[PDB]
Structure 1
Amino acid sequence: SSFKAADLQLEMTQKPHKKPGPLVFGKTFTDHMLMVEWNDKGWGQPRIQPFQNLTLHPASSSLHYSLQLFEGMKAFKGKDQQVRLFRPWLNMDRMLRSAMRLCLPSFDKLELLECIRRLIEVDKDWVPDAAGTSLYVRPVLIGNEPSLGVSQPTRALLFVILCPVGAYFGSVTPVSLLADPAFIRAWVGGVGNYKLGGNYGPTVLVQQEALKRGCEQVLWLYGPDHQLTEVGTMNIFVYWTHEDGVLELVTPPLNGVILPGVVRQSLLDMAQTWGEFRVVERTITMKQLLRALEEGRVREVFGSGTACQVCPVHRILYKDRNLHIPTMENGPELILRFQKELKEIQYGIRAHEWMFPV
């Protein structure tokens, strides 16, 4: 069964937060949150309430066995103050897949989307409109059984919090990546293709190691052929002339060790629609990248994700071998084009079915 937006209960805040006057990601929260509880009677009524702490039993399975998943998606405000969510249906789809993998309760994707819309509407004045700014939406679903048994929970909590977010860049600044095969994010037969809290905790130490070695983010390698899987919390794309002499955009396939990014899917959809070069999903190895760089066949390498939309890469430290990636010497033409078509769509400059109006 599902909670219904029709049953929403609104508790407006009596202690509104002061709004920002330099926005740093994930530190500043809006005045309200969504909360829906689930138990043996099913889902309770959803409520929009003032941002507040959670009260959890010390044995909550969310805290002992990581019965927890989350999402991340942005709302954008156009010039005329219309707020729109980018492809939120895909986030709902992904959140439901995560829930099933952790044996957490199902819900109706459109009911949740409408509750989220209602929440953003309430806090609409928190949505910034300066260039490159957005409102970040963080849904979370956790198990909440007061039992140390490793088992399917009979209680759960679903909540959503919101953060206004500043510009990521106006001009794209590239990043350096540490590529060490010692580090593994996910594996075939694992859960790297679900947005589960458990996938992220172990990366904290690795990211520290990337900084210690003078890099900004982690290029996650997998397997004996040192496959390039993902970069930090972004999918990875390479724009090059492949070994067969064909200009192509390649990104690793959804074979279980990649999170299916919404931006990733959008970039594939956009480039396939242009019909100007080959667009493929295929494994990418460090062997191929090295050879391509030596042959001058690499144009651009970048990450995709909700944080920045598209992020150029200029350097990869592969163990002790420092590799220059010529992205910024090549425009970066494709990155700029993607960033432009997404900006026009996201801020309402071009009407589009990918946007969900609030």
Structure 2
Amino acid sequence: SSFKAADLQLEMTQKPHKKPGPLVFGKTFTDHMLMVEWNDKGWGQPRIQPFQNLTLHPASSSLHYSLQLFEGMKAFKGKDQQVRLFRPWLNMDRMLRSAMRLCLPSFDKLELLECIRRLIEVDKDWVPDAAGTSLYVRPVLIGNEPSLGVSQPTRALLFVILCPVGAYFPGGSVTPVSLLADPAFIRAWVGGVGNYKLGGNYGPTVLVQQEALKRGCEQVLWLYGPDHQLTEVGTMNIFVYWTHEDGVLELVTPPLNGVILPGVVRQSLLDMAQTWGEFRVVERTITMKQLLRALEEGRVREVFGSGTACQVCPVHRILYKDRNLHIPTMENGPELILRFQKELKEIQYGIRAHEWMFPV
């Protein structure tokens, strides 16, 4: 069963918030939210209502056993003032896989997307239009059983909130980051749930990020296995553009073998690069041994993260235990990074019509 967009009830706010004139991520919210409840009778009617607090029983399984998941995607306003979502169907697919993994109720992906469209329409004037700005969309699905039994919930709650966000690069120019690479830290494991966007994967990273700051780095490079596989960078997927040990110029990102969150940007980068057909594009594990060797031999061109936050984020330094490694990304253009950002911009802000964009 599923809630239907046709049954949406609109409750307009009677206390609209003043909109921002420095947009700090995730702190400023729009006037309305989507809310849908689920119980033994199935899904209730979906509603667009004023942004407000959640009321939760103290035994809510959302709070005791982390029956919670979320999504993250962006709406962009072009010069034509039309608002469009970037490949939202993929976020809906990923959200439904997350729900199944936590035994939370299934919903219809197109119905949720239409409800999200309607919510964005209502708050469309919150969508900024300055260069590099967007509206960040945060759907959440939580279990809400008033019981301490660890079990499949008989009640759940689905909601969506929205945040206007400023440019990730406030100088209009990509700025690289430093990463702490310590094999002591583990984000996810084969047989785990690191490949789903579940609240539980993020909580334990807070301390590790504090340690990266203490050691003078900006983000965490998550290592896995005896061979020190480079898996992810903070909450971004990792890409390396290099001449591989067989003399072939290639773009590589780690495969979806369970420890990688399948990013929408990640898939888009692979799609674009495969479409150009100008170099080899692979999904393969990347080890610190291969990286060190490639740096020494001058084979590394660019290393970057991909994610909804920044789209593409250059890396210039990796602190691996005591060894400070310069990554020559910015000394190589960064040609690929700039090319990806340009093409994504064209697609996202409607400069070039595209099947990847969902109009609001």
TM range (shorter): over 0.9
Q: In 2, distance between residues paired with 1:352 and 1:81?
A: 16
Structure 1 residues 179-199: Cα deviation after superposition (integer angstroms, max 9, x where no partner): 000000000000000000000
1:141 aligned partner: 141
Structure 1 residues 148-194: Cα deviation after superposition (integer angstroms, max 9, x where no partner): 00000000000000000000100000000000000000000000000
2:3 aligned partner: 3
Q: Secondary structure at the match of 1:171?
A: coil
Q: In 2, distance between residues paired with 1:268 and 1:320?
A: 33
Q: CA deviation at 1:56?
A: 0.1
Q: In 1, distance between residues paired with 2:107 and 2:181?
A: 39
Q: CA deviation at 1:47?
A: 0.1
Structure 2's unaligned 5+ residue stretches are none
Q: TM-score, normalised by structure 1?
A: 1.00
Structure 1 residues 108-135: Cα deviation after superposition (integer angstroms, max 9, x where no partner): 0000000000000000000000000000
Q: In 1, distance between residues paired with 2:350 and 2:310?
A: 18
Q: Secondary structure at the match of 1:339?
A: helix
Q: Secondary structure at the match of 1:117?
A: helix
Structure 1 residues 230-263: Cα deviation after superposition (integer angstroms, max 9, x where no partner): 0000000000000000000000000000000000
Q: Secondary structure at the match of 1:182?
A: coil
2:252 aligned partner: 250
Determine what percentage of the aligned residue pairs are the same residue: 100
Q: In 1, distance between residues paired with 2:73 and 2:173?
A: 22
Q: CA deviation at 1:58?
A: 0.1
Structure 1 residues 46-85: Cα deviation after superposition (integer angstroms, max 9, x where no partner): 0000000000000000000000000000000001110000
Q: In 1, distance between residues paired with 2:65 and 2:307?
A: 28
Q: In 2, distance between residues paired with 1:131 and 1:316?
A: 30
Q: TM-score, normalised by structure 2?
A: 0.99
Q: CA deviation at 1:99?
A: 0.1
Q: In 1, distance between residues paired with 2:218 and 2:273?
A: 28
Q: In 2, distance between residues paired with 1:200 and 1:155?
A: 24
Q: In 2, distance between residues paired with 1:80 and 1:128?
A: 13
2:75 aligned partner: 75
Q: Secondary structure at the match of 2:223?
A: strand
Q: In 2, distance between residues paired with 1:154 and 1:81?
A: 43
Q: In 2, distance between residues paired with 1:52 and 1:165?
A: 20
Q: CA deviation at 1:90?
A: 0.2
Q: Secondary structure at the match of 1:350?
A: coil
Q: In 2, distance between residues paired with 1:350 and 1:177?
A: 35
Q: Secondary structure at the match of 1:187?
A: coil
Q: In 2, distance between residues paired with 1:80 and 1:276?
A: 33
Q: Secondary structure at the match of 1:112?
A: helix
Q: In 2, distance between residues paired with 1:287 and 1:104?
A: 41
Q: In 2, distance between residues paired with 1:338 and 1:145?
A: 44
Q: 1:179 aligns with which of 178, 181, 185?
A: 181
Q: Secondary structure at the match of 2:140?
A: strand
2:334 aligned partner: 332
Q: In 1, distance between residues paired with 2:275 and 2:304?
A: 20
Q: CA deviation at 1:307?
A: 0.1
Q: In 2, distance between residues paired with 1:18 and 1:209?
A: 37
Structure 1's unaligned 5+ residue stretches are none
Q: In 2, distance between residues paired with 1:40 and 1:17?
A: 36
Q: In 2, distance between residues paired with 1:220 and 1:355?
A: 31
Q: CA deviation at 1:320?
A: 0.3
1:103 aligned partner: 103
Q: Secondary structure at the match of 2:110?
A: helix
Structure 1 residues 89-116: Cα deviation after superposition (integer angstroms, max 9, x where no partner): 0000000000000000000000000000
Q: Does 1:316 align with 2:315?
A: no
Give runs of ≥4 in structure 1 deviating > 4 Å: none
Total equivalences in the alignment: 358
CA RMSD of aligned residues (A): 0.2
Q: Secondary structure at the match of 1:22?
A: coil
Q: In 2, distance between residues paired with 1:310 and 1:64?
A: 35
